[PDB]
Amino acid sequence: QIQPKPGFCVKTNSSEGKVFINICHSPSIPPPADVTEDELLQMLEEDQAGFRIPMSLGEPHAELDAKGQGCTAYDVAVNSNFYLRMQNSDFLRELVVTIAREGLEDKYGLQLNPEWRMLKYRSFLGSISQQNI
Amino acid sequence: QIQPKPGFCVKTNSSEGKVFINICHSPSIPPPADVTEDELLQMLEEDQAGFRIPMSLGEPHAELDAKGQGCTAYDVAVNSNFYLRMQNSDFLRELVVTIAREGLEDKYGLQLNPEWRMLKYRSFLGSISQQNI
Ligand SMILES: [Co+2]
Ligand SMILES: [Co+2]
């Protein structure tokens, strides 16, 4: 089993309560092809990101927020080199988080509310070494 | 006739030579609806930006680059308030430039090479007051 490395943590919410998405990474996860930005838009218009941007869409795990309240986390893990590209591009980072949100909704039957933010001081919600992919 | 206001200038290239895209603006151009980022991804996957992100796809105009060499400019003008949002979001700015590039290719039969950059010291290539939309 592959243990993910923390990347960054996205806080959002839903009619079912608070949700955190750990955008995390591993060198064991296949990277997307390195396409141009023009080609990336094409991928979206052809609705092919489901196959062309590999990511793990992790199972929900119950956790606690900083106020000690119950919430739900999901680990979305991508290739480490791809993660490092995402970090250095607001465009790519926001796009990939948006794709990951859609992926979790479709996979788990969730309905997220649209507002989200990347946490500044906390990288991952949950026990990392317990969250094998 | 509506005169566009300069926004920023994108330098790119093509098998036909150097191309500049003036991402410019006017309060007379209808704004896109103010959708969420989740909804924006949906718009792209449904390939509906052609109707849902209004922009003028300006006619080509011959100009000169800083080296005195011939090149071609196109003015892509959006609503001023929308422009100001784009400015303060790398994600939105890169997405809209990518959409504008596609729009010009489809409208004018162009094939742009993928590399482009936003000029840092020059806002618009061409005679602004002559470029009525
Ligand atoms: Co298209
Ligand atoms: Co979809």
Author numbering:
A (entry chain A), B (entry chain A): 47 to 179
Task: Reproduce, without paraphrasing, sentences from the article in which this PDB structure was first reported.
The R2TP complex is found in organisms from yeast to humans, and consists of the AAA+ ATPases Rvb1 and Rvb2 (human: RUVBL1 and RUVBL2), a TPR-containing protein, Tah1 (human: Spagh or RPAP3), and Pih1 (also known as NOP17 and Pih1D1, but referred to as Pih1 henceforth; Kakihara and Houry, 2012; Te et al., 2007). Pih1 is the multipoint scaffold of the R2TP complex, coupling the Rvb1-Rvb2 hetero-dodecamer, the Hsp90 chaperone machinery (via Tah1 in yeast or Spagh/RPAP3 in metazoa), and the TTT (Tel2-Tti1-Tti2) complex implicated in activation and stabilization of PIKKs (Hurov et al., 2010; Kakihara and Houry, 2012). The biological roles ascribed to the R2TP complex are directly associated with its ability to interact with the Hsp90 chaperone system and function as an Hsp90 cochaperone (Boulon et al., 2010; Izumi et al., 2012; Takai et al., 2010). Here we present crystal structures of Hsp90-Tah1-Pih1, Hsp90-Spagh/RPAP3, and Pih1-Tel2 complexes that together define key structural links within the R2TP core in yeast and in animals and reveal how R2TP connects the Hsp90 chaperone system to the TTT complex involved in PIKK activation.
Interaction with Tel2 involves the N-terminal segment of Pih1 (Horejsí et al., 2010), which contains a conserved region of unknown structure (henceforth, PIH domain). The PIH domain consists of a twisted five-stranded β sheet with one face traversed by a helix-turn-helix segment connecting strands 4 and 5, and the other face traversed by a coil segment extending from the end of β strand 5. An additional α helix connecting strands 2 and 3 projects from the end of the sheet and packs against the larger of the other two helices. The phosphopeptide binds to an intensely basic patch in the high-resolution apo-structure formed by the loop connecting β strands 3 and 4; the faces of β strands 1, 2, and 5; and the coil segment C-terminal to β strand 5. Our structural and mutational data characterize the PIH domain as a phosphopeptide-binding domain that appears exquisitely adapted to providing specific interactions with phosphoserines (and possibly phosphothreonines) embedded in highly acidic surrounding sequences, characteristic of CK2 phosphorylation sites.
